[PDB]
Amino acid sequence: NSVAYSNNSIAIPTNFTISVTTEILPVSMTKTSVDCTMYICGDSTECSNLLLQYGSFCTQLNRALTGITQNVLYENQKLIANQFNSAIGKIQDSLSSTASALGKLQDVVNQNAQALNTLVKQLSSNFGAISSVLNDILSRLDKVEAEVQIDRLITGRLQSLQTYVTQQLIRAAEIRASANLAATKMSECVLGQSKRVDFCGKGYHLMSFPQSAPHGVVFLHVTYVPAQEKNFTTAPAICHDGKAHFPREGVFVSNGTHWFVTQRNFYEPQIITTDNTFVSGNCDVVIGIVNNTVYDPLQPELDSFKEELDKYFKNHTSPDVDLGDISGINQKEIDRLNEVAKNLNESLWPWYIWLGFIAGLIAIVMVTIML
Amino acid sequence: NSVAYSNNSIAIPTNFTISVTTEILPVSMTKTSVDCTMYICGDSTECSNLLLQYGSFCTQLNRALTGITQNVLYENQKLIANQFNSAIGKIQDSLSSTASALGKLQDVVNQNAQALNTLVKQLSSNFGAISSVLNDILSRLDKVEAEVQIDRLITGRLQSLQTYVTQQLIRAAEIRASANLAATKMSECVLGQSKRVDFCGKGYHLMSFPQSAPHGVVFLHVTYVPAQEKNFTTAPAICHDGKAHFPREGVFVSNGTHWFVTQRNFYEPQIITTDNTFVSGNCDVVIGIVNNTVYDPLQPELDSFKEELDKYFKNHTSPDVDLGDISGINQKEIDRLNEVAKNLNESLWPWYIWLGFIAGLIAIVMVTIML
């Protein structure tokens, strides 16, 4: 089911008013080349310095936009003397042995102290080197942790700049088409006279006059709009006994009883003629179908982030450091000596009788002589 | 060499069938604004959190799409006594000296032990701090190593999202042009009648009827297609004696002997007239050349990656740590003493004869008295 022979009330102009139309068309586009430094980063120093590492894409993007008883006592004397002498010998040996052992102890202790001092020096050097290296690590750590975010924001603003570039290229591709439309509107209407409805001025084109504009052209079309029009029932064809008679460069204005081939753009009824109407056969209407399907582009569909990530993403986690736990590396006699020191500090007739006998003997001799 | 005066067999319609054409044109486009979170990252948490750092480009991209024998013994006694006394003095001095030296050794050893304990404590604090700091370093190391890859995939999907945006802007720029074509097809054919071939319905336009569609317009053009046509040899001009006579709004259908100015769209031969043909001079054909060169944009050519990289890329490599190598910091007498200890443990008449003589003397005196 379609609509061919049906006569409906369509307006046919009974009259016109002269008219003019001022039609503006942009024909050129300013080359809006873009500074990406100010656009993406602008005044912030770190992102500006990072943009330098983003290459010359900037000019590249501008590339798009710039175009487009005497004996025993003597024996005891010898005894005490020899005991004392042997004692002296063992004291001297005790002394020598104790001195040697004490010196070896004083040696090993001082060697332990020397090892302590050398270990202290070596460990101090170790700790200085470690502090320096780990400080360098943490400092460059913080710098990288900042710069990765600054670059992430730069990358996210790159998408905005590229959307800007894309929309600008779109606009310039529309500009060149509007310039071609300007060219043909100049051709068909300033050099000539357009026969098409509303083309080159509202109504029907009589004349055109071109004028320039900073990026466009304006046409003053003197035309005529229909001052008055009347709705006549009209059939683009009428089928008489199986033969389709359809007007020749006109329309079947249906009069009260007759069909006239009137002018489409003016009420001027003119009777059906085979010179006013072409004739067909079989009363058959060819049905056409047209769909101007504008191109639908192949949009870039992606996987979900997890699949495209774990495809290459390695989830490497470095281990907790564990290092060696050095925490697991664990007078009475002097009194006796001093006591024995202080303790060692602590334990540090015949002639007369015989003479009397001799005197008595002499006395007796004297008495005997006296008698 | 071109083709002007040559008459070739071109079809001229002997007849027509009435016809209708249903012509669909999309006039509007849905604003397919895009969520970038679901598009790029979707459900994965880490990339979603990272997208927050990518700025509001999302809305920005939507911005595009929402628009668009007694004396000697006494002397020896004195000797042993004085020897013993002097020995005692040297024993006491040996004792005092050994005690002082032994106490100094016991002091320095305990000082070495104290230094050991203090060094152990200081080193334990050192190792705890180092473990904590390097664990922090390695942990944030792993996190950054993951996030840089997650952001790399985000950045690579940003290109897909921007290609989507670009293709959508392309499609909308085609949509607005199809809407303008819809406007002119309404104008020249519903308000009027198109004179152009196949424009507004297959064949030749008789009438049009517009109807809307969710994003388009459909025109029912009642037209006429040529039911029958015959191939007549035709010359767009014929040059009689150096003067080019070319039909006036018609074509030179070459009859068996004559040229007729027939209607282009219908076989209706009509004899050459100067009202049927314009006349030229010199038989000269102007040759025109036209190339509608669609704009070829300035594509953003780049250097190779090495030149744009080493331009700013610094290949800094931190050195291998080297730190101090602390690995390079390297009884007989007691027996004699004990032996001498245990060794030191080990070496810890006249009256009668004279009385007999006196008795003999008294005996003699008695005998003498008896005589």
Place this chain on the structure above:
Amino acid sequence: NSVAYSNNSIAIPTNFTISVTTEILPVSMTKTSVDCTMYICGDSTECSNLLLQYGSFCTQLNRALTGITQNVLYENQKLIANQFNSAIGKIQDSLSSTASALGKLQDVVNQNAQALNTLVKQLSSNFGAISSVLNDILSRLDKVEAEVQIDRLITGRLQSLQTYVTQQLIRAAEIRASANLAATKMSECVLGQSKRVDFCGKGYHLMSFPQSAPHGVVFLHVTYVPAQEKNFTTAPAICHDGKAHFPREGVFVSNGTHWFVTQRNFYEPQIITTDNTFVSGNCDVVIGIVNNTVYDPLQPELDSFKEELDKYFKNHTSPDVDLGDISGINQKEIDRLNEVAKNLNESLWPWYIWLGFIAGLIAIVMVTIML
């Protein structure tokens, strides 16, 4: 103020020359699919390996482009013996005590040496682990510091590749429109004859002949250009007593005294008639204004980098490491002993007279006997 009734000198053709126009139109575009590996990174290995982490955007971008005196002496003997004995006892006790204390010192010193060796071993293990871990840290540090710059350049070249993609989609969207123009130029001019000025060949179209081209179509339009034309003063309408008479499919060539409705495309003056001119009322000119405003897209304006940065940017700075400063962990008697050692090395009649008396007594007895 506009321009309707004013008659200006416009050229009307007095004559024509036959002509031909060779019109080339590109109708198809080669699918310039792009390898992103060679484009962005090319031959450099590290950026190539990094591109693998950028996902399959490559094909996605191709998705766009592929489409689109005896007793005292004895007492002194006992004295020296007991003094010596007690001295021996205190020497033995001094010996035992000194030996025990010296052995305890030799024990504690060797324990200090053992603790030194164990601490050395534990610290060597600690230093080896620390060196390994911090070397790993610094090495992956340098690698990440290089890769972030390589990826930054990749991301900056992604913008160039996307600008290329956008411009290519622009070009293909122009290609399909040029193909539609080719379609209509074939329709209205090879199947028919164009009535529009310069459309399908310079001048006025007589015939067209289509021919293919690797991505285009060329039409040979036999047309006629105006050989001669004369500038006649012309008014698209003239207002007689308030009624606008404007020519019917012609122009008012202003003769010396009269207006003729001449053919626009040929000097053929024909007198004003109501069949040559439509008539209006009130002498009123309708003034129309038209501006074909090509779509200006909503460009993605961004904040300054600081606001979009500090929105999520955290300026975390890890502290300077400070670790424990281990630098803060700080014979006369033997002479006396040896002196006393060497010093200790250093201090290691009655019968005859009575017999003579007895002999004198016997001598006296002998003398007495002799008397």
